[PDB]
Amino acid sequence: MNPIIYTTLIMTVMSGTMLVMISSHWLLIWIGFEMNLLAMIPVLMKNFNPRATEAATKYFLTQATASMMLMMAIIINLLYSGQWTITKMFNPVAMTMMTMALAMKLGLSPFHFWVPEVTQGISLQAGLLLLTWQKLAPLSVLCQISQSINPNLMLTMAMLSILIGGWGGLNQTQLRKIMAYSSIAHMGWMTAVLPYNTTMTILNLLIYITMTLAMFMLLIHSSATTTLSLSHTWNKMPVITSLMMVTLLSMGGLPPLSGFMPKWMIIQEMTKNESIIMPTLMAMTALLNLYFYMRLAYSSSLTMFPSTNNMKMKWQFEHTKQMKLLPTMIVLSTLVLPMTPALSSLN
């Protein structure tokens, strides 16, 4: 795009979510969700390729429909209390309505089939924006109305994300598809802890955000979208693959890496809430995520893969993009476990 015109589209959506996290009025929250969608569509179709045209259509139809379902959740609450402020909802079906409506905007439960296809069609740079920033807007509302949430309603949504995210992730080939499924699996973790204490929901969000940028911008540097294409990068840029491995271990969740940050506190939090069978399933099924993390780890750096003659030409030229914030993002996503008591700052 024209650099100045892509800039405003990048940050009209920055402001769209910014409205949601600051609006105290129900209508205004929908307003920010509208600008969220209205600015997301062009970015997904920066390159104008039939994958993007499909990805935009699938993304738009899903988000628009969820937005409409959100409105009548707003109307029903108005119909039964006449209150436009955001507080605990004053009617059950309205509460049930927006939980599904907000879920589809985020996408954890069966409302998740759009997530893989949309990111697969669109470019990697727009992939991180969809998988990182487009999740704060739905989560901000959920953390706001967590008091009125239905404990049964959310938790079954939470597992169905991690089980689906855990299972289907094994069979995926395209790195964007794997990243999307891990995002679905990660999405389940904080949504499950959302009814109990939203501090860990935000804590899981921040850590997951840090891990995803480290994942996406490294892949952008690799200029690769397939496992085999990522496999070749061992020879040209061995350092990146080594960093690819450490963030994969981190975002797998193994201690003392920062992936043990959210789970451990989340496991601890629900255990204080007498829910003990619930954490065990999520912790155990989290290994499904680790398997295709291992699969990517094996093919990236741990075992070198066959290369091509033409890539000797690649060594002759240096990189151009400075991939801003990459060094600090990696370190902030690997060795922050000893700073765990910093979670008290959020609350």
């Binding site: 795009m1 015109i5 405003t8 589209l9 009209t12 409205l19 205004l28 307003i31 509208e34 600008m35 209205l38 600015a39 569509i41 062009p42 179709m45 390159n47 104008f48 935009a56 029903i76 079906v93």
Partner: protein, 175 residues
């Protein structure tokens, strides 16, 4: 009769939705919404709300829906299905008929319909309030606050529409 006129219109409103919810030919589906759009204003009109109702005619029925069917006109295949055509379309229509008949029958006999929302089945008119409005229309004086109280609304809705104008070109540019 005349007491149930809002109910009568509301009934046509529902069956009007079945017209386009059944997903017929896009032109014919638009027409089914056009009547549905038309009657819905009358429901609003009977409750007051002249200006809010009039928009449904102007900027939606004569507005959004005009370019809607206009797009269906130059798009779509050379063989537009006539409402009967596919048996599913008529199956959907009769399906919509049985939902409104069962509730309305249930509404006017037992008056204790509890489907999702518990709603008691009385006439439309037992909900209106009382009191004189002086010399100012409540609807007119409410949305006239767009420029006296609608501060943050105008700033945001105006900004998005400008982004609406830029997003539509960027998608339609073709790179």
């Amino acid at each position: 009769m005349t007491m149930y006129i809002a109910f009568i219109l509301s009934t046509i409103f529902v069956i009007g939705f079945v017209g386009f919810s059944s997903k017929p030919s896009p032109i014919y589906g638009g027409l089914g919404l056009i009547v549905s759009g038309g009657v819905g204003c009358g429901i609003v009109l009977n409750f007051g709300g002249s200006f809010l109702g009039l928009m449904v005619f102007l900027i939606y029925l004569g507005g959004m829906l005009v370019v809607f069917g206009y797009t269906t006109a130059m798009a779509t295949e050379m063989y537009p299905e006539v409402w009967v055509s596919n048996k599913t379309v008529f199956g959907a229509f009769v399906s919509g008929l049985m939902m409104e008949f069962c509730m309305v029958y249930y509404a006017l006999k037992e008056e204790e319909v509890e489907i999702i929302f518990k709603f008691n089945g009385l006439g439309d008119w037992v909900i209106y309030d009382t009191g004189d409005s002086g010399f100012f229309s409540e609807e007119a004086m409410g949305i006239a606050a767009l420029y006296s109280y609608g501060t943050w609304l105008v700033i945001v809705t105006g900004w998005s529409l400008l982004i609406g104008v830029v997003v539509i070109m960027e998608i339609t540019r073709g790179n």
